[model samples]
Target chain A: MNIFEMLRIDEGLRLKIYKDTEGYYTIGIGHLLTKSPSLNAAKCELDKAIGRNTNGVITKDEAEKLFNQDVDAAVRGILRNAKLKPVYDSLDAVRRAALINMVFQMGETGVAGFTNSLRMLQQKRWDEAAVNLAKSRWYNQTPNRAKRVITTFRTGTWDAYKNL
Target chain B: MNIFEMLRIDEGLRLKIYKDTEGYYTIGIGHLLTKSPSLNAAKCELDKAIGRNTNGVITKDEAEKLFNQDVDAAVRGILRNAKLKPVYDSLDAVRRAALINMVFQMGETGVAGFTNSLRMLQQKRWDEAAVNLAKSRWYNQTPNRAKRVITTFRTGTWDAYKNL
Candidate 1:
């Protein structure tokens, strides 16, 4: 079965997967299912599945196996119940991924608390949006990763995937 | 006098400006500041001063005329002391802006929280980041503005003062 099918993900689940994983095609604890597992198990299963799909390479899988699922659940919960429906609905696939990546790393509650950037998005101002994206505390926290994501949003390419 | 000297912004104020506007400049908050005279005055003055130095269209006299010390303080407060620092420092300018943009528009803490995106950033994974940024609740909140930021981030040419 394809990754989505393997996970028994339906439209809601797909959206959730799209929403939760930002369409990375990985299955982790609290991915769509109600039962949340530990980060180790969730990451492991997710990595194994991704590994099996992508020419048997094991980089991402291993990484996933190491992530904390409870944290992931907390993150997803924050995102699912967010109140900025307008901003969420307006994003293209790539932008959505970029935002989701931030939430995933920072946790939903923390990410949601960003007031300035959120205002720009609400107003639908483009340049401001890009600039705001670059000004986060997280930007320098992990420059390489931040740059890669910024590049992706800028270029609309999956080159970052190749690098990873 | 130089922009700093002319404005009479002390070291503390300068640092605050840097800290407060760090996310604002990185993620792009010219418009937000523009709307609020208090916020707009300092941003405009700085933009003009920076523009003059860069041989751009900005004029120092105009900047001085429009400058607002109080607005500068407010913007600084938003940037340096906003509770989102932990989350902000962890994300890139683009993702940070994206989250902030949503929060600004929605005022809903949950909407701006991005669990999936955070994971991608933490792992320094790009594809996932792109997806997350694009799939925010604030994505469509303001189509024109959202598209502009999303497109700019995707294009990679979005610099600090481009919007100003």
Candidate 2:
């Protein structure tokens, strides 16, 4: 699957403010608004686009733009991390995309903290990596998405998103 | 919480047909189109709305219209069923709306078939009703959504949808 499209579906688009499963204030496509000025700019852009104050709301186009920027930032963040750079560079496109998706959901620091899973992935041990990833708090928090991401890492294919 | 807004977030919108978790052909906010003429007319209307044959696609407006129709049908179907009508009429609007949401996901027949759960609900045994519903295969199939619906049934409140 195209990473962008997969993320758009997975993250979901919301024009108005909503709380996620974790009770974080988020807008747009998984755009975390808690303690961030990025939200202020996005909220302003949306209000300006519509020629009215929307009170914690954004336009669809603005959401899409923020999503693209978030995706780019996730990619860059994953690649720039010193410990994960070598591991990320060694993977095929599909597996790399899986890592990018993981980073998009959780921050780069979150994924980077998966020391055993990262080691297993770096060694090209797909099953081991999958098992290691599954034994984490992230998996328990969002099993459905985590399962898909783990499968993508294991199979190195877009098949995990086939019916998504 | 507003049921329409809640359903919109839960069902999700798709311009093209996508297989649900059960691999059924679904589009436009969980509109199931497998072996149904409703699919043909909806697809036709969608194409007409876009002023072209979209192959197998629908517009956002078309999706919303279809969603409204489905919600209406679910409500009517639940109220018309002889076995469920009295049970439905006995509840306040919040509890009634919960039932409507359940019918919208799994047809009136499906919700009606929860015999023990229905009986418990009718007798105002909220905890027993929740327990009975939780014991079913529906809970296993879509645990997260089921949890929300079951909580709404038990509490007779919209708190289940608070962070939704």
Candidate 2, residues A10-112: lDDT per residue as tens digits? 7778889776787666778887655222344344434433445678767788788788888898989987998788898999998988888888988889888
Off by over 4 Å in 2: A35-54, B1-164
- Model 1 chain A: weakest 10-residue lDDT segment is A7-16
lDDT of 1 by residue, B64-130 (tens): 3334433343334335533544545665655555444444433434432566655555565655565
Q: What is the DockQ of candidate 2?
A: 0.01
How much is A143 displaced in model 2, in angstroms?
1.3
TM-score result, candidate 1: 0.28
DockQ of each candidate relative to the true complex: 0.01, 0.01
Let me know the DockQ for model 1.
Answer: 0.01
**CA error at residue B27 for candidate 1, angstroms:** 49
* Per-residue accuracy of model 2 over B86-126 as CA lDDT, tens digit each: 78898877888778878898898888888878888889999
